[PDB]
Amino acid sequence: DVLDEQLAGLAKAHPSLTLHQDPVYVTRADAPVAGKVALLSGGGSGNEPMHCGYIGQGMLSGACPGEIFTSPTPDKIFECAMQVDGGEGVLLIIKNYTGDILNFETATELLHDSGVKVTTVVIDDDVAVKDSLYTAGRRGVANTVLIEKLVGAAAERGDSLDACAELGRKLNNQGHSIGIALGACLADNEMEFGVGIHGEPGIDRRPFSSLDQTVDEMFDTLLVNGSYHRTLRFWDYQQGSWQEEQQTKQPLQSGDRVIALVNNLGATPLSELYGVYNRLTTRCQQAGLTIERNLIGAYCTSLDMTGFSITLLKVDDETLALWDAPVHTPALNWGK
Amino acid sequence: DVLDEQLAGLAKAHPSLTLHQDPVYVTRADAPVAGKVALLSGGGSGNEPMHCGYIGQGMLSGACPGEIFTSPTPDKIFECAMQVDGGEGVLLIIKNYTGDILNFETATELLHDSGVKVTTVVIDDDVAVKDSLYTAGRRGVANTVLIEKLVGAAAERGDSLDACAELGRKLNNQGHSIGIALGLADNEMEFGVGIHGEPGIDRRPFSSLDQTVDEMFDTLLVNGSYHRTLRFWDYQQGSWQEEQQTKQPLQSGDRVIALVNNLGATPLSELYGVYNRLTTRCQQAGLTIERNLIGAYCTSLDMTGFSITLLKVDDETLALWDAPVHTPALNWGK
- In order, the DSSP letters of A236-285 are ETTTTEEEEEEEEEPPP-TT-EEEEEEEE-BS--HHHHHHHHHHHHHHHH
How far is Cα B169 from Cα A244, in angstroms, rounded to an integer? Answer: 65
CA–CA dist B196, B183 (Å, integer): 13
| CA R_g for chain B | 19
Candidates A6, A197, A263, A290, partner chain B, best to mutate (most B CBs within 10 A): A6
- Name the nearest CA neighbour of A204 among A217, A216, A185: A217
List A51, A112, A198, A229, catalytic entry: A198
CB of A192 within 8 A of CB of A179? no
Q: Give the active site residues of B.
A: 196
Are residues A132 and A98 in contact, defined by beta-carbon separation less than 8 angstroms?
no
Distance CA A105, CA A126 (A): 21
Query: Is any Cβ of chain B less than 8 angstroms from the Cβ of A68?
Result: no
Sheet strands side by side (includes B38-45): B17-20, B25-28, B62-68, B38-45, B90-95, B118-123
C-alpha span between B263 and B271 (Å, rounded): 11
φ/ψ (deg, to 5) at A152 = -55, -45
Q: What is the identity of the amino acid at A73? A: T
Angle between helix B98-113 and helix B74-84 axes, rounded to 10 deg? 50
What superfamily would CATH give domain B2-174? Dihydroxyacetone kinase; domain 1 (3.40.50.10440)
| CATH code, A175-336 | 3.30.1180.20
The angle formed by the CA atoms of residues B77, B81 and B87, to the nearest 5 degrees, is: 165
Closest chain B C-alpha to A237 CA, distance in angstroms:
36
Resolution (A): 2.2
Measured CA to CA, the distance from residue A85 to residue B112 in angstroms comes to: 62
The angle subtended at Cα A263 by Cα A303 and Cα A276, nearest 5°, is 130
A104 Cβ partners below 8 Å, 6+ apart? A71, A74, A77, A92, A94, A120
Going through A89-203 in order, the beta strands assigned E by DSSP cover 90-95, 118-123, 175-183, 190-195
CB-based burial, B68-101: b 16+ in 10 Å, e otherwise: ebbbbbbbbbbbbbbbbbbebbbbbbbbbbebbb
Method: X-ray
Say if residues B320 and B58 touch (Cβ distance below 8 Å): no
* Interchain CB contact of A16 with B (< 8 Å): no
Beta strands B255-262; B288-295: pairing state:
parallel
As a whole number of angstroms, the distance between CA B265 and CA B213 comes to 17
A12 to B268: CB separation less than 8 angstroms, yes or no: no
* Domain boundaries, given as residue ranges, for chain A: 2-174, 175-336
A56 Cβ under 8 Å from any chain B Cβ: no
Instruction: State the DSSP H helix or E strand holding residue B65, giving kind and residue range, or none if neither.
Output: strand B62-68
Chain A contact for B30 (CB, 8 A cutoff): no
Q: What's the per-residue H, E or C state across A52-121?
A: HHHECECCECEEEEEEECCCCCHHHHHHHHHHHCCCCCEEEEEECCHHHHHHHHHHHHHHHHCCCCEEEE
Q: Which CATH class is domain B175-334?
A: alpha beta
Question: Residue A328: how many CA atoms within 13 Å on its side-chain side?
Answer: 15
Task: Give the whole-angstrom CA distance, residue A294 versus residue A131.
Answer: 29
The span from the CA of A125 to the CA of A123, in Å, is 6
